[PDB]
Every structure is written in structure tokens, then in C-alpha cells.
Write a protein that binds this ligand. Structure first.
Ligand SMILES: S=c1[nH]nc(Cc2ccccc2)c(=S)[nH]1
Length: 134
């Protein structure tokens, strides 16, 4: 047993708050915001040795990242940003920092009760997205 066991599985989005405003702050344009804001993704998390894989799948976009904690990687986000990402575990929370064009956003993923809560922050704007097991 290990690091991220409680994150592993298949998760479905059940609620969202403030995601449009978060996307505005990130620089997402109108049409992408509308279509992405409609998405109801599933998030599929798996671990094999030191490698964590997170897939996001929706009618908008299917993405997949694989990474080792603490080890930077380049990521193309669903909204087509080219970012440099580092994901760490901080007191049981997965903390994902994305850097691009002098900007930064942080995505935190945590287990709370039977939920996986995703908090996305870009400057003063936070969006909270709640997932439940599929
Ligand atoms: S929690 C969650 N992760 N990833 C996506 C795709 C996405 C990422 C960044 C900006 C726009 C859309 C969604 S819709 N929800």
C-alpha cells in the first residue's frame, strides 16, 4: 500500500463552482470556456510503481498525464496551453503547479469523505470541482 492509494480509481464530476471565472483568469477564450464548462469529465487515476497517471475524459477533451512526484514535465492542457508542471504530495494533498508565459496556476486534489475534491486557483480566483466514485 502506498502514496496515493486513496486517489486511485474512476471518478465522475458531480458539482462545479466558479469554473468559468477560473478559466477567464487563466486566459481561456469564450468558445472554449462554454464547451469546457459544459463538460462532465471522468477522472481516472492509477499508479504503477513511482509513476502516477491521471486521465480526464469528457466530450470536450480526453487528456492523459503521467508523472513522478517532484519531477517536472511538460503538459499541453485541454485548453491548449503549453505548460511546465510539477506535482507533489503535501500532507496527503496532490499539489499540481503549472507554469507558462510568466504565469502560474495551482490545482490541488484531495480526498474528503467519499469525494475527490479538485481546487483550481489562478491569482485570487478559486474553482472547486467535486468528484465521486463512478
Ligand atoms: S477538473 C477538470 N479537469 N480538466 C478539465 C479540462 C480543462 C482543463 C483546463 C481548462 C479547461 C478545461 C475539466 S473540464 N475539468
Amino acid at each position: 500500500s502506498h502514496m496515493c492509494d486513496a486517489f486511485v480509481g474512476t471518478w465522475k464530476l458531480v458539482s462545479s463552482e466558479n469554473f468559468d471565472d477560473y478559466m477567464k483568469e487563466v486566459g481561456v477564450g469564450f468558445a472554449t470556456r462554454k464547451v469546457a464548462g459544459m463538460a462532465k469529465p471522468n477522472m481516472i487515476i492509477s499508479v504503477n510503481g513511482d509513476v502516477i497517471t491521471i486521465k480526464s475524459e469528457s466530450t470536450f477533451k480526453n487528456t492523459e498525464i503521467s508523472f513522478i512526484l517532484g519531477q517536472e514535465f511538460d503538459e499541453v492542457t485541454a485548453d491548449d496551453r503549453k505548460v511546465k508542471s510539477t506535482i507533489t504530495l503535501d500532507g496527503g494533498v496532490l499539489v499540481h503547479v503549472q507554469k507558462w508565459d510568466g504565469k502560474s496556476t495551482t490545482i490541488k486534489r484531495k480526498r474528503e469523505d467519499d469525494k475527490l475534491v479538485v481546487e483550481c486557483v489562478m491569482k485570487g480566483v478559486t474553482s472547486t470541482r467535486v468528484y465521486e466514485r463512478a
